[PDB]
Amino acid sequence: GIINRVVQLLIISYFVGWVFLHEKAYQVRDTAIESSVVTKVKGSGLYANRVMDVSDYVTPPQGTSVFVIITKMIVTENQMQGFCPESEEKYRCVSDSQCGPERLPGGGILTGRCVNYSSVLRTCEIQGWCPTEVDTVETPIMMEAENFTIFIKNSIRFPLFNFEKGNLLPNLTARDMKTCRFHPDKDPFCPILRVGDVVKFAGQDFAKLARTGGVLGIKIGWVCDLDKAWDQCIPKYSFTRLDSVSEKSSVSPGYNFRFAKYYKMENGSEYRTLLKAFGIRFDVLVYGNAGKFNIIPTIISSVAAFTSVGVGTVLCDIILLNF
Amino acid sequence: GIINRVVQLLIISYFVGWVFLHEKAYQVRDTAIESSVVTKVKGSGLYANRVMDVSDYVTPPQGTSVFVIITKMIVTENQMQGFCPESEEKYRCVSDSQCGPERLPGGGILTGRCVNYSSVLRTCEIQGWCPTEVDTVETPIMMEAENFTIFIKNSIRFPLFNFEKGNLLPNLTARDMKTCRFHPDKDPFCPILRVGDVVKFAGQDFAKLARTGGVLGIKIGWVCDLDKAWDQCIPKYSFTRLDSVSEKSSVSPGYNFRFAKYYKMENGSEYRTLLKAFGIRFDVLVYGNAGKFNIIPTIISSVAAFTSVGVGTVLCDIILLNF
């Protein structure tokens, strides 16, 4: 008999408490958040006893939500089209018959010939950009990169509610930019993030990550209850490493890619500088949903709540009557 | 007593009208729209008394759904690695003690020394790419850019219904491309959009936007009722400015980025041309959902409608009986 009143309290609390209140059934929700992100990196480093600025280590440069900060390089200066032996021992050859299709991808096409790369070693000859890259000793990382800064201008808009806000507040001043200390909880509206800080929030050691290369994700969540104050709608920053496989795998441990700088002589012959770039890739991911009170969902939701509590008490009353 | 019939009409109309008809409950919905976008910009401009074509002002060039049309530039010709004084007055120095870590990011690393940039001004010395960029007088914009054209090939497919359509209709002809006048309502299937037109649909003044740089969004919505004719499935174009913060903020008012063109001498020394690019970034965002009649959701939906109207009339009859 008392279980009837208990079931009544559980139905009333669930349908009018969790379902109606905690789940904000009284609210209209806009999930089609409109976002824009623009980035700008600042910092200088020493690599190969040359200074490197944003135009040197950031790629691509258009300042989108995805960019790489190069932290390590294998530089192959002044390549030219020709014939030459492969560098890595993986291509060791003793007989021209060993230079066949079974060989792994290399600097160029295989001539089928076999040449002496050094007095000690002989490898397969190739036609392509010469000489081939040599990966014998590890190259250093750009330590200063740990201090580079990432400027994030993130604009968001829930169009359903014609609501627009950004991580740059309207009262932001040049002094603020010069002196604010970003923190996900303490100061979410500082547009400057320290690269080393982002790396550590992601649970990574800058030395290792910069040695191997990797992909970090900067997630910005705008979950805003537009019923509350405009100043309560704040961004929630989360950080992670997206190439999680890389750490668990020995075959491919990081992130790197190759690109070239192309030159011509007055003579007119082409020559290029090859670059194997290791770096940290930053992905800025913006998500959000908004909700504001609307009478319609309050009517439908409350009516559904009364029909739900009524159906509940009715079914519990019947099941109690028969048993 | 009459309120019973009134509640019956509201239940029947809601559950069989809005819920069943207006909300197309009889329809199966495909929301996993598959989209592809390819772009090509055309136009030429005069900047620095040089002609600039797509290969000069568009970046990146692969013709994806995101590209920049550069409208303004600060060009720093023939930089070389070395030592030189900072250009901007923000780095004004009188004592070598003022050249310390508290200085903002600059063209290069700080030597700690202090040098005379000009007879009137002395600033901190740096090691890096020299000379530093000078932002003393504003550079002009490429006015002709207002007339550039954006060619958008947008392919979409709802795989659930094996339905494929694109903004390029199959009966599109070379004359059409040469002469069609795009309009979101009047002619949605013209693949050529005037840059100035896109800027104005976004509610922007090309002169100012091209002066500051900005991000414009071109939204293409494919909301198609596959029950109706194939020719009723048309794209809905919307335009906006995505970096909405930029206009409300004095600290960062637009969109720009820096990149360099790299050269070598026959002598073999590296030198580069630095570029501070202001431009309009275009983001083509494609969204859509499709629906087609399927008997299953018609059965489940109609049965739910009858159970709903029945439960409604039952509860209203009981509440009327007790009170």
Added chain:
Amino acid sequence: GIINRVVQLLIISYFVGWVFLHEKAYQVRDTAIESSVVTKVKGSGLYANRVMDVSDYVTPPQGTSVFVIITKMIVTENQMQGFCPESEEKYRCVSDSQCGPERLPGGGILTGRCVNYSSVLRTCEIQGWCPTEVDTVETPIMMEAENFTIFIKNSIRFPLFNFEKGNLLPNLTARDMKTCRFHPDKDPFCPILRVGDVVKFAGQDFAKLARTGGVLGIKIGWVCDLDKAWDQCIPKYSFTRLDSVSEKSSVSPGYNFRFAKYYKMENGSEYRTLLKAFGIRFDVLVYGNAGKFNIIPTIISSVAAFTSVGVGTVLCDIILLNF
């Protein structure tokens, strides 16, 4: 009378069979899948009797989920700023009055003058990068591209369940990479995909696709029932052509774009090599949802199932009683 028991079996089977079991109502679902993709292409080709490696034909190079493999080129060597006649016959001119605004976009700005491109043909003069591109005879494709390989490191994580898996399994070895044969069904965990294979899975002929250029989509779906074994969570590969309009349209049949390589003389004058690139663009699209048993949705779902079967038998009993 028997239809009462029939309706009872249909209600019990639907609400406790399809709705509760097949639809995994007992499961909590994570749809906010977190994905990261990194790519690396390998292969060499012969084009213009030059060898071309990843740094030559892949763009952009940062190894993101979207990249192009260039398969065809129209190369315009050593352009310089100046005046010259238009190449294509579309610009045929006989009178300087015909060189007006009605002309289509061209290599540069129009001088209004008219010049002889050849003894046989006269066209409009332009100021810009000279000479203009000549598209008279078709250029060959890089046949070897059919054998290039795409290395895909895809990391995914459902954070709700703190679940992380990737297409590179932890027991992957160098021999595996050197010898595994990717197949969507037979071997989903081989990170190496043959370009020609991807083209054919997409239902395309490499010769034609490489002639016109196109966009291929590589969809990777992680639909995982975390109740089952960790080894049951496997990626589902799908392949398609995303620019479906291109094949059905005569006006624009493929995918290509233009970019330039910039050079300077010791003299200091700028000159560039123009490139019209035809290639296959690969879009790696990752989707997924996960589900794991949770007691809460089992309670709510089972209670909803009993209330549903009860309401069903009640309404069928009443409708049977009155009629």
